[PDB]
Design an enzyme around this catalytic site. Structure first.
Site, PDB file in Angstrom:
ATOM      1  CD1 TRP A   1     -21.268  62.438 -24.716  1.00 25.03           C
ATOM      2  CD2 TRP A   1     -21.784  61.086 -26.343  1.00 25.03           C
ATOM      3  NE1 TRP A   1     -20.302  62.816 -25.700  1.00 25.03           N
ATOM      4  CE2 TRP A   1     -20.760  62.021 -26.847  1.00 25.03           C
ATOM      5  CE3 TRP A   1     -22.295  60.477 -27.484  1.00 25.03           C
ATOM      6  CZ2 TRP A   1     -20.270  61.856 -28.191  1.00 25.03           C
ATOM      7  CZ3 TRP A   1     -21.769  60.351 -28.794  1.00 25.03           C
ATOM      8  CH2 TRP A   1     -20.770  61.244 -28.984  1.00 25.03           C
TER       9      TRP A   1
ATOM     10  NE  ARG B   1     -23.519  74.545 -30.974  1.00 24.30           N
ATOM     11  CZ  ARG B   1     -23.352  75.576 -31.552  1.00 24.30           C
ATOM     12  NH1 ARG B   1     -23.787  76.320 -32.613  1.00 24.30           N
ATOM     13  NH2 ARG B   1     -22.882  76.567 -30.361  1.00 24.30           N
TER      14      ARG B   1
ATOM     15  CB  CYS C   1     -25.852  72.081 -28.358  1.00 23.23           C
ATOM     16  SG  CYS C   1     -25.055  70.531 -28.556  1.00 23.23           S
TER      17      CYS C   1
ATOM     18  CD  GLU D   1     -25.952  67.489 -19.914  1.00 24.15           C
ATOM     19  OE1 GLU D   1     -27.254  67.621 -20.412  1.00 24.15           O
ATOM     20  OE2 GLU D   1     -25.159  66.783 -20.412  1.00 24.15           O
TER      21      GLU D   1
HETATM   22  C1  HEM Z   1     -23.433  64.244 -28.229  1.00 26.64           C
HETATM   23  C2  HEM Z   1     -23.431  64.515 -27.105  1.00 26.64           C
HETATM   24  C3  HEM Z   1     -24.075  65.947 -26.897  1.00 26.64           C
HETATM   25  C4  HEM Z   1     -23.252  66.673 -25.827  1.00 26.64           C
HETATM   26  C5  HEM Z   1     -22.383  66.243 -24.774  1.00 26.64           C
HETATM   27  C6  HEM Z   1     -24.174  67.853 -25.551  1.00 26.64           C
HETATM   28  C7  HEM Z   1     -24.071  68.667 -24.518  1.00 26.64           C
HETATM   29  C8  HEM Z   1     -25.140  69.814 -24.439  1.00 26.64           C
HETATM   30  C9  HEM Z   1     -25.438  70.302 -23.075  1.00 26.64           C
HETATM   31  C10 HEM Z   1     -24.627  69.826 -21.834  1.00 26.64           C
HETATM   32  C11 HEM Z   1     -26.268  71.251 -23.238  1.00 26.64           C
HETATM   33  C12 HEM Z   1     -27.005  71.978 -22.182  1.00 26.64           C
HETATM   34  C13 HEM Z   1     -28.208  71.135 -21.557  1.00 26.64           C
HETATM   35  C14 HEM Z   1     -28.621  71.896 -20.318  1.00 26.64           C
HETATM   36  O1  HEM Z   1     -27.926  72.529 -19.833  1.00 26.64           O
HETATM   37  O2  HEM Z   1     -29.971  71.733 -20.148  1.00 26.64           O
HETATM   38  C15 HEM Z   1     -26.735  70.954 -24.524  1.00 26.64           C
HETATM   39  C16 HEM Z   1     -27.887  71.829 -25.203  1.00 26.64           C
HETATM   40  C17 HEM Z   1     -28.537  71.417 -26.463  1.00 26.64           C
HETATM   41  N1  HEM Z   1     -28.059  70.383 -27.207  1.00 26.64           N
HETATM   42 FE1  HEM Z   1     -26.593  69.358 -27.009  1.00 26.64          FE
HETATM   43  N2  HEM Z   1     -25.262  67.836 -26.630  1.00 26.64           N
HETATM   44  C18 HEM Z   1     -25.142  66.485 -27.097  1.00 26.64           C
HETATM   45  C19 HEM Z   1     -25.872  66.165 -28.562  1.00 26.64           C
HETATM   46  C20 HEM Z   1     -26.908  66.703 -28.977  1.00 26.64           C
HETATM   47  C21 HEM Z   1     -27.819  66.358 -29.883  1.00 26.64           C
HETATM   48  C22 HEM Z   1     -27.742  64.980 -30.548  1.00 26.64           C
HETATM   49  C23 HEM Z   1     -28.700  67.269 -30.169  1.00 26.64           C
HETATM   50  C24 HEM Z   1     -29.662  67.332 -31.118  1.00 26.64           C
HETATM   51  C25 HEM Z   1     -29.739  66.711 -32.433  1.00 26.64           C
HETATM   52  C26 HEM Z   1     -28.514  68.707 -29.398  1.00 26.64           C
HETATM   53  C27 HEM Z   1     -29.090  69.606 -29.359  1.00 26.64           C
HETATM   54  C28 HEM Z   1     -28.924  70.573 -28.209  1.00 26.64           C
HETATM   55  C29 HEM Z   1     -29.971  71.410 -28.031  1.00 26.64           C
HETATM   56  C30 HEM Z   1     -31.314  71.829 -28.912  1.00 26.64           C
HETATM   57  C31 HEM Z   1     -29.651  72.123 -26.757  1.00 26.64           C
HETATM   58  C32 HEM Z   1     -30.476  73.240 -25.985  1.00 26.64           C
HETATM   59  C33 HEM Z   1     -31.686  72.878 -25.329  1.00 26.64           C
HETATM   60  C34 HEM Z   1     -32.188  73.945 -24.691  1.00 26.64           C
HETATM   61  O3  HEM Z   1     -32.386  75.137 -25.092  1.00 26.64           O
HETATM   62  O4  HEM Z   1     -33.298  73.731 -23.518  1.00 26.64           O
HETATM   63  N3  HEM Z   1     -27.355  68.118 -28.760  1.00 26.64           N
HETATM   64  N4  HEM Z   1     -25.966  70.152 -25.404  1.00 26.64           N
HETATM   65  N1  LIG Z   2     -26.181  65.495 -22.881  1.00 26.19           N
HETATM   66  C1  LIG Z   2     -27.218  66.620 -23.749  1.00 26.19           C
HETATM   67  C2  LIG Z   2     -27.495  66.381 -25.048  1.00 26.19           C
HETATM   68  C3  LIG Z   2     -28.285  66.881 -25.491  1.00 26.19           C
HETATM   69  C4  LIG Z   2     -29.356  67.779 -24.889  1.00 26.19           C
HETATM   70  C5  LIG Z   2     -30.017  68.663 -25.393  1.00 26.19           C
HETATM   71  C6  LIG Z   2     -30.996  69.452 -24.810  1.00 26.19           C
HETATM   72  C7  LIG Z   2     -30.778  69.507 -23.345  1.00 26.19           C
HETATM   73  C8  LIG Z   2     -31.735  70.653 -22.438  1.00 26.19           C
HETATM   74  C9  LIG Z   2     -33.264  69.844 -22.224  1.00 26.19           C
HETATM   75  N2  LIG Z   2     -33.544  70.292 -20.897  1.00 26.19           N
HETATM   76  C10 LIG Z   2     -34.495  71.494 -20.997  1.00 26.19           C
HETATM   77  C11 LIG Z   2     -33.870  72.436 -19.889  1.00 26.19           C
HETATM   78  C12 LIG Z   2     -35.002  73.596 -19.693  1.00 26.19           C
HETATM   79  C13 LIG Z   2     -34.836  74.865 -20.758  1.00 26.19           C
HETATM   80  C14 LIG Z   2     -35.588  75.744 -20.514  1.00 26.19           C
HETATM   81  C15 LIG Z   2     -36.612  75.763 -19.386  1.00 26.19           C
HETATM   82  C16 LIG Z   2     -36.585  74.879 -18.349  1.00 26.19           C
HETATM   83 CL1  LIG Z   2     -37.368  75.106 -16.910  1.00 26.19          CL
HETATM   84  C17 LIG Z   2     -35.574  73.975 -18.622  1.00 26.19           C
HETATM   85  C18 LIG Z   2     -29.850  68.648 -22.740  1.00 26.19           C
HETATM   86  C19 LIG Z   2     -29.021  67.979 -23.458  1.00 26.19           C
HETATM   87  N3  LIG Z   2     -27.772  67.310 -22.913  1.00 26.19           N
END
Ligand code: HEM
Ligand SMILES: Nc1ccc2ccc(CCNCCc3cccc(Cl)c3)cc2n1
Ligand code: HEM
Ligand SMILES: Nc1ccc2ccc(CCNCCc3cccc(Cl)c3)cc2n1
Ligand SMILES: C[C@H](O)[C@H](O)[C@H]1CNc2nc(N)[nH]c(=O)c2N1
Ligand SMILES: C[C@H](O)[C@H](O)[C@H]1CNc2nc(N)[nH]c(=O)c2N1
Ligand SMILES: [Zn+2]
Lengths: 411, 407
Positions: free
Chosen positions: A280, A111, A108, A285
């Site tokens: 947000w 953070r 993420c 994305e």
């Molecule tokens: C507040 C604004 C936030 C922004 C701009 C942000 C940004 C991002 C982005 C761009 C990604 C990659 C998403 C993707 O390519 O699919 C991501 C992944 C992630 N973020 Fe955030 N994030 C935010 C808030 C949060 C919150 C609130 C949480 C949970 C409490 C969170 C937990 C995660 C997790 C767990 C991932 C990884 C998901 C995965 O492995 O598929 N984030 N974040």
């Molecule tokens: N802007 C944000 C904020 C929090 C987020 C938290 C998590 C995510 C990613 C959730 N999408 C799952 C993407 C994915 C993961 C693994 C396998 C596959 Cl097919 C697709 C995007 C977020 N974007």
């Protein structure tokens, strides 16, 4: 042991000691790096150590480590484990845990915001209608008429593996996908399988390009039920370009609230299988991935066509040109409608400051470079040049199998 | 133990078995991934020799033949009495092609089997090395129709008689620190430039001055030589639509020729093995031109384009970046100098991975390096899972010689 990471643009070197507190495994070995692989009932046995480690962390965070309140809590949790085989988290511990799972989320980029997280405790929820009500309140609170606020809603924890709470949707708000007889897809191709389940379960599909999917909600291990999010609660942004007036005529829009609903939250050895959270968007994305992936809406050709670029040679960089325009359009549309969004320069710069602060105050910041580097313009953001260490801390968010692969239908 | 890699755009899944033949270590452990870190005796030599000759004789379908056993015997005898051994030409050529084949960070490996190997093991002096290098440069450049090549100097002996090219690439531009405190030319080479200057080089002190070669034969002090300007093919950079682009005064050289790496074959170390192919456009237009610690020209370009540089959200850096890169490709193409764009190169690499998976059981690949530094997710490698591991023969980094050499 100390471990150093270097930024190759600034020569700033940082020292990681936090990795020592890591327990879970990476997938990598001394002979293979798995750094680009997408995905690489507990008994009281394994439970009390996991509870203890967590409460030691929590009591340290509040400067009460080794206090009478710390020791009494350990004793009470321990009694509860052996007599009931599980335990309940206090409110304060739940809040601490959910925040830390975000803090520890190595993929993420957002953070810097981890400490501002509205935690909604929904552990008293018993039914799917109860879940729907909690999710509605979450969406309304998090949306805040365009001024987005980070939030997580936490349903009851797993008990025997047979009474799970699950949100079947991958995100609270997503567009339907429909595979057509001629093999084309209408709407979002990522959501075809999920869409099919919804239809079977009885959803009447409007069958357009941007239909907001219904919620499919499983309480207490029962069969999931369908609910429609009130449209008034779903904030959407029509996409237009500041200079190109034909852009609007592409018919594009996106929703404002990114709300992931399929992850598992792990805190002190407890498993919260339904824990939808939202923040947000980072502009890429939507503009890069949702719109321009070949497997998603795939608008690159039709945008470059309308810009009248040279499409006969990839070396004209017609794709790269169309890509920047679409991303300017996404950022412009969101800003104009006053819906919170962050561009990838601003977000990565913030991340680098967050990470430096974390090495300073915390001793480290686990980070997955493959995911942190944005999917366009990689090397002109500061993260491309930052060495990063990836390791797994708890509390954490984890993947879990899609519920339709595992659910035992009651009929 | 048998590993799966999935392409998430196409759903193609490949099974990797080749990793089980890996010897060298990665930097990673089960507790920590180091995927984004840039740099992570007689008794020893015979197993290394055996492992190499085993794969050599297997590749020519003669594993377990008398000729195989004889060579193992012969090299073994030679190690016992000489404490080293010599590769036959055929083994040397196989070893070099395989070092490229195994380079997990190289997107250009579809070409691995077309590599011209120049044997310079008979070289003894720095003038000798200069000659071989000019011949290499002229051969590879081929008037703009570039061909891949490597030149291999004598192997390490007791490690006090090392052959080294002190340059990081055969052709690079000078970097000078200014009275201002800014930098003229290429900041990456500021130090090597001072080493040249203190050695004797009269520097023109311009933006784009081709560095002299500093060549070390046989552990001796290195010596300076100018590459005949006529052998250095350069490309003036213009844009196919922006008239003013040529006014920026940008140029780059055609031949990317890496000269500071170490080639390891069968336990033997070749500390001077300069090699060259041709450029992918992004190396110049994204990294050389736009990196903050390189020529760093995004601001000047965005300005000439009259972009709103007030807010990062106008994506003015991204707009300027695309145009710089269209210009680099356009210039090389107009001048008929071989160049590949990142869409073409990465499409080739996917085709190569599939070939290697089929014919060899896998392909070590470092995703962090293979994904281009612009437009990542619109190239197919972004969506391709990759396993990274270390096979031999290999190219390896080695310390800069000036920290090592004894003057
Ligand atoms: C507040 C604004 C936030 C922004 C701009 C942000 C940004 C991002 C982005 C761009 C990604 C990659 C998403 C993707 O390519 O699919 C991501 C992944 C992630 N973020 Fe955030 N994030 C935010 C808030 C949060 C919150 C609130 C949480 C949970 C409490 C969170 C937990 C995660 C997790 C767990 C991932 C990884 C998901 C995965 O492995 O598929 N984030 N974040
Ligand atoms: N802007 C944000 C904020 C929090 C987020 C938290 C998590 C995510 C990613 C959730 N999408 C799952 C993407 C994915 C993961 C693994 C396998 C596959 Cl097919 C697709 C995007 C977020 N974007
Ligand atoms: C034929 C055209 C070739 C293309 C288009 C090409 C492409 C590339 C590119 C883009 C990189 C990344 C470089 C960077 O970002 O600094 C790279 C790395 C590399 N390539 Fe190639 N390559 C070619 C030929 C060769 C040849 C002939 C060899 C050796 C025989 C080679 C060995 C390597 C090695 C060892 C690396 C990694 C160097 C490092 O880790 O710093 N490549 N390749
Ligand atoms: N077009 C090509 C062909 C072969 C190549 C072979 C190697 C290279 C990279 C050479 N530079 C090394 C970059 C580097 C790596 C690690 C540390 C540092 Cl300071 C700098 C680029 C190539 N480009
Ligand atoms: C194969 C590769 O690991 C996969 O495509 C990853 C690459 N990096 C990513 N980075 C982010 N933020 N999101 C993603 O979905 C991916 N996909
Ligand atoms: C920190 C990070 O490992 C470093 O910036 C890498 C990232 N990927 C790269 N990829 C290539 N091809 N070349 C590079 O120099 C780098 N630098
Ligand atoms: Zn790793």
């Amino acid at each position: 042991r100390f471990l150093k990471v270097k930024n190759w643009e600034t020569d700033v070197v940082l020292t990681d000691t936090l990795h020592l507190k890591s327990t879970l495994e990476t997938g990598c070995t001394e002979h293979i790096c798995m750094g680009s692989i997408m995905l690489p009932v507990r008994t009281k046995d394994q439970l009390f150590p996991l509870a203890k480690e967590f409460l030691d962390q929590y009591y340290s965070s509040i400067k009460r480590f080794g206090s009478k309140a710390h020791m009494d809590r350990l004793e009470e949790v321990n009694k509860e484990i052996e007599s009931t085989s599980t335990y309940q988290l206090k409110d304060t511990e739940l809040i601490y845990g959910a925040k830390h799972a975000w803090r520890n989320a190595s993929r993420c980029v957002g953070r810097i915001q981890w400490s501002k997280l509205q935690v909604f405790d929904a552990r008293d929820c018993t039914t799917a209608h109860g879940m729907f009500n909690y999710i509605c309140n979450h969406v309304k609170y998090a949306t805040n008429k365009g001024n987005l606020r980070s939030a997580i809603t936490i349903f009851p924890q797993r008990t025997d593996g047979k009474h799970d709470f699950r949100v079947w949707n991958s995100q609270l708000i997503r567009y339907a996908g429909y595979k057509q007889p001629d093999g084309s897809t209408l709407g979002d191709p990522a959501n075809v399988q999920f869409t099919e389940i919804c239809i079977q379960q009885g959803w009447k599909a409007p069958r357009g390009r941007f239909d907001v999917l219904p919620l499919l909600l499983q309480a207490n291990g029962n069969d999931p039920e369908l609910f429609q999010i009130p449209p008034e609660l779903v904030l959407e942004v029509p996409i237009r370009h500041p200079k190109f007036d034909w852009f609007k005529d592409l018919g594009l829009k996106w929703y404002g609230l990114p709300a992931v609903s399929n992850m598992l939250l792990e805190i002190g050895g407890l498993e919260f299988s339904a824990c939808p959270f939202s923040g947000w968007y980072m502009g890429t994305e939507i503009g890069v991935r949702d719109y321009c992936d070949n497997s998603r809406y795939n608008i690159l050709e039709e945008v470059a066509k309308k810009m009248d670029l040279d499409m006969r040679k990839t070396s004209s960089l017609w794709k790269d040109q169309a890509l920047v325009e679409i991303n300017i359009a996404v950022l412009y549309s969101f800003q104009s409608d006053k819906v919170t969004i962050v561009d990838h320069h601003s977000a990565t710069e913030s991340f680098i400051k967050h990470m430096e602060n974390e090495y300073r105050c915390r001793g480290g910041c686990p980070a997955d470079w493959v995911w942190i580097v944005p999917p366009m313009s990689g090397s002109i953001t500061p993260v491309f040049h930052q060495e990063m260490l990836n390791y797994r801390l708890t509390p954490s968010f984890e993947y879990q199998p899609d519920p339709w692969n595992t659910h035992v239908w009651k009929g």
